[model samples]
Target: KVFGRCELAAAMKRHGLDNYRGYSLGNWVCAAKFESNFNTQATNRNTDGSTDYGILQINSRWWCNDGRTPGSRNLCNIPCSALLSSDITASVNCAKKIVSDGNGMNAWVAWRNRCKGTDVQAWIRGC
Candidate 1:
């Protein structure tokens, strides 16, 4: 795991990532936690053929290419494996594009389902 729950808030806040296109810091923390437990290399596959990758759980269907995922769109112009890194730059940039494309944070099912109505202040309390 790259960050502990509170550590994520601090690091993201330090990098000014707490607010991206208007989403709250708490939303990010909540989503990241649910998506990958803060692990940079997390992955999940679905029977429908799509797969999720990295800290944000970006989908292979439209965001990246892992040789194992056929017909992967790789819209981010990055290899899916690239998302699993100690460096967060590429993931952050791709996430911005995902949000800019229209869904905002709603692009993440983790956020919509687990964080949307919850009290997330604890995620950003000391950050």
Candidate 2:
């Protein structure tokens, strides 16, 4: 699913991302926006050989196991393919764990560069 901004916002909020770790729903939306532009099937391979998957772009290196990333932590204990679904439940749940693990929203570098320290409320204002 290639979600509209508000569509992604609504889905994420329903999955308990709202104000998670002191980050607003808009902040979560902003992370998805910059990371995968809300594409559920998005994938990006890093130079380190770890792949990022799905809208939140969770990493294979420390999050999901792709069966390819060396020394993958698989902290989410899910297959990387699970993140590519439009259901988004697995992805959202893992995102929560990422924040709970103390990485916060900074788990996504795109969030730091594009969404952090910004007025992200606009991402969810009209929803």
Candidate 3:
């Protein structure tokens, strides 16, 4: 796990997540907090025959190819595991692009369930 939200926030901004698309940094920070607790090694399977990857829990059903989903759009064109790296440059890139593809941050279950309307400023405090 990361040291805290501030560390993750700096890493994210270093990867250019400051204000990509129209989403706020809080959207990214809180969403990742609940989805993976800032652990890039995190991975989970979905009931819809998809797997969530990395801190953002990006899905193989649309973002990356996990081999389990042969017909996935693989829009990110990288292995789903790539997002699990401690270095999150690729994960950050995929996240910004994924959110831009529509549905906004609501594309993430974590976002809708936790970060959607919460006062997520705490996620980036002192960062």
The most accurate candidate by TM-score is 2
Candidate 2 Cα misplacement greater than 4 A, ranges = none
User: lDDT tens string, model 1, 1-127?
Assistant: 5778787777666656677788878888888899888998898997868788888898888887777776777888888788888666677778878877887788899888988889876677765
Ranking by TM-score: 2, 3, 1
Clash list (residue pairs), candidate 2: none
Tens-place lDDT per residue, model 3, 1-127, is: 4537888888887888777787778778898988898888888987778899988889999999998975689998899878888888888889888888877888888789988888877778777
Instruction: Give a tens-digit lDDT track for model 2, residues 46-89.
Output: 99999999998999999999999998999999999999998999
Q: List the residue pairs that clash in candidate 1.
A: none
TM-score of each: 0.88, 0.97, 0.92
True-structure RMSD for candidate 1 = 1.7
Q: Which stretches of candidate 3 lie over 4 Å from their true place?
A: 1-3
- Model 3 sits at a Cα RMSD from the real structure of 1.4
Q: Could you report the Cα RMSD, in angstroms, for every candidate shown? A: 1.7, 0.7, 1.4
- Higher-TM-score candidate among 1 and 2? 2
